């Protein structure tokens, strides 16, 4: 919430955000 | 996400000739209709091609648009014009006025002569264009050694003479501080081949109007500002 | 025998029996196309001007050292009376454009030693360097009458007095002769060849030349190895040259010069 | 060859007509009217000694006003007008020297070279501060013939020039580069503007200054804030009509 | 193996010709003329003590003028010329030391390494202020051989250099980064420029300085505003013709 | 809407070698035609491959483009050149002049020798290239232990000798402060194998011109500026 | 040589560079 | 004349330039 | 310096940078390629002479 | 590692990075 830019993020998703991973 | 930028070393510079536009502050405005208009022209070259007057010197050193000829054949040219869009004789022609705002030219020059003597007056002139390298032609023998045309008076009043573009370089300068092989290109001289001849009751002096303009393949390039002066 | 070569040009012909081939500078020839900077149709294909003009150049003695040289400004070297119809046509034209095909001659014997460098160079300084006087029309384009020494051209030669010269380290007419071999050339080694054959196209700062103001090409003969011979061998060794203007072009017909 | 100039038109020849020659033309388009005039040329200068947060009041100081009339032709205070108007002639600023600067404002390059009777275009204006002191200025652009509205501030300590819906610009701070630029459309009620002379009057009792057309400009620029600012004009989509003589140049 | 240098050309061999070896070449293109010369090298310096809003007047101060001639070859005031011209030789600024700086302006890297007789290119110019005081300057670029127009101001308190249609640049303010850069096209009437010597004269009576070609430059840069500015040249789309000797270097 | 930007930490920096262009202030301009031109070259390597002269020392310590040989076989080399584009003997060759403007080189070097003695003079030379590691070769026995070619005089006047590129590294430095294993690569020495031999009436000293240039697979890289000097 | 930007030049080629033309 | 940018103008044509209209 | 009042360091074709002014952010950054004649560089010790 | 921009590099790969080449 609170992101409203139409062009994709300049930094890749792996870098812009922490990587969510399931341990199971 | 915000975009990373590298601010160039010329930040804030105002470039008078950048090929880009700036911010419109009063857009969506209609430009007052002018579709009824006539006389529009889109190329300044059009102007260069219109023959306008050369300034010849009076016997009192006053400028006039013509030269005199009479019943004799002088051993010297009636008029001499150095081919330079800088020549003082053409300083006020449209050709020169436009050329003063450009750096270089290329192509033909048209020198138009209009005989204004009486209908009863006859005669022949030899219009010569001498390329440089051996100086100005001193005699008719020399002037005929270069590019020339014989103009015979008669029913048709004028003669359209072309100074061919003969140059070591593809383009030539329109002005200069000191003459160089790229800014001065020879001389156009008009000689009296046969004397102006006529019957009694006709004034001895005939006036020939002189005009110049760019020829068919004449072009100018590189918009510039000429040396400013105070009008007077 | 593969070294016997004949070359015709108009009513002239050069012949050699020790050629090492003809070197084409820049791998180009002047084709004789009219300059696109002139509206007047050029005068060309004048057979009486497309020939070899042969002239004596110098005497080679044991006193000449490596890099001492002789310059032949072109087209000026042939703008005099001995340039025949090429000259008489040239003098009456504002502009000229042409290439050069040249053969320099020099024979010794199998008992003499020494070698010369024969090359063509564009914008090669032909002014006199034995004075601090500004070069003038009648001194700048003349064929060298004497061998030129070499030391004073390495860093150029300023037309300034001897005391000012001290504060002038480099002049634009400099010529690093150690690299003169980068110009189209051939070597005349006495043990190998008595002739050198070169040809260069037309190069300039513009389409055609206002020759009266510019000698754009210069034929240069420099010694690489000093002349040597023993007591009894022929002592008079001379250098000659046959110069042919290749398909010259003339534009801007007018009255003659001088 | 022969011809007859009395026709009012003679042919444009090249060397091939009379001699053994060829046409020698090369493509070139830098002579196009649009391209030629599409570049910025100095055309005016402005000066203000009032701060941003104050009431704008017309002033003159050594021939420089704090507002200008947007026209390449000479403009200046005429017969004590409140704001500058289009002039009919140029005068030296100095009463003695008889050398420029002139007291009148204009695009010298346009005056010296305008071989046409009428012109049409949009105007790109550039305003630059003459020194490096941080800029703090407000400029109001008023369309051709619109009210100048030289009124009082309606609120304390505010720039009166910004108290409008008219297009205005506000530049200030250490992050700015001391200049302003923008483009305005042609706004005159006239279809095309006279580039040199207007052979008539502007009102019905023919009492105006003969030679000046009514509303022949691109509007006005009023400025407040400290400093001297130079102005440039750039003619966008320029179109010209009816060829006419250029300014005369003294014989060499 | 054997060969004959008198031919004027011998083969380019690798180790395999005479020995049991292999060619060992690796691709590389940093030796291309275009790539080599396509980088900025210091080539001139400029100095002005006049403000932006004043009349530009040619000046010299300790061998630095307030205008330059755009050419990699040495240039300087020659025999009291109004503006700098191309020189034919380099001189020490000092009359005693016999060590550089030189009084003449040039691209040392070009002079020291120009193994060709003629060259052709566009010119990318960079102008940088030598200190950190906020810049406030106006530069006028004049095409090769065009009028310098060293005239008076036509309007009070305006930079005379900006009073032109010639390309000019104006940088000022706290938001700027004290430099200017731009690229100009080749404008000389000559097809190609002489890189070292020009074996001839420039006018018809052969009275000019032998060795200097007519209009062999990229135009001029005139500057007004306070400061000392260094200049760089970068040769775009560079093309060279006719190989020739490099400057001689003293034997070690 | 306006785009958000992140001004990098190097704002306003002027990069002399950025691979990008700047603002054109006089566009739409034609570059004066030069299609008639000849002699154009596009790679500086072309220059490196042209054999130019090496500077050998005179008996008076003066520089000359050749060395002397006569009717004897010295126990020491007639000339010795260290293979470095930095060698003072090749300081004025086009190869060195170009190499001074590049950081590294790779590939063959061609050393050209031209016999200038009389046609009646015969003889044989042994041209040797000794890689480093064990110092300069002190005798013919040692010089023959390395890369060498025997040059026999006769009809053909010159000998094109190649110094093979033998190096621990793919590229080698063109200059240096102090010699290193990446900037100095051995020696080229020419010995007299058999004495120059000839008949009576022939000068005792024969001159052999010496030139150098890059070979077929020679390359340079990394444009740089060499240590400046004052011409003299 | 020495131009290594993948996105096309912002200024058109006619303006960014002088226009090369053959006279023949 | 004198516009040489290859990417389209950021401001629409109606706003960047005055709108040309014929009254007939 | 080959010319008066110029930065001698800029008097080269070698890559150089010039930053100055009130609009700059007091730093410089750039990337250079590996230029050593060695294939790989020793990270700690080099058991030999040069 | 450590490059996470989705739009391609502005400078070409030959210029942004040294060119890797095998001698065999």
Short mmCIF file of C-alpha atoms in Angstrom, two decimals, chain D residues 32 34 38 122 234 236-237, chain H residues 1-3 16-18 20:
data_model
loop_
_atom_site.label_atom_id
_atom_site.label_comp_id
_atom_site.label_asym_id
_atom_site.label_seq_id
_atom_site.Cartn_x
_atom_site.Cartn_y
_atom_site.Cartn_z
CA UNK D 32 14.79 28.46 -44.48
CA UNK D 34 11.92 28.91 -39.88
CA UNK D 38 14.56 29.73 -34.64
CA UNK D 122 5.14 31.95 -31.32
CA UNK D 234 13.38 33.00 -30.22
CA UNK D 236 9.02 29.54 -33.15
CA UNK D 237 7.25 28.34 -36.32
CA UNK H 1 13.54 24.61 -38.37
CA UNK H 2 15.83 23.89 -35.66
CA UNK H 3 14.46 21.09 -33.86
CA UNK H 16 3.64 23.31 -27.03
CA UNK H 17 2.57 25.34 -30.08
CA UNK H 18 -0.26 27.73 -30.84
CA UNK H 20 -3.24 26.85 -36.40
#
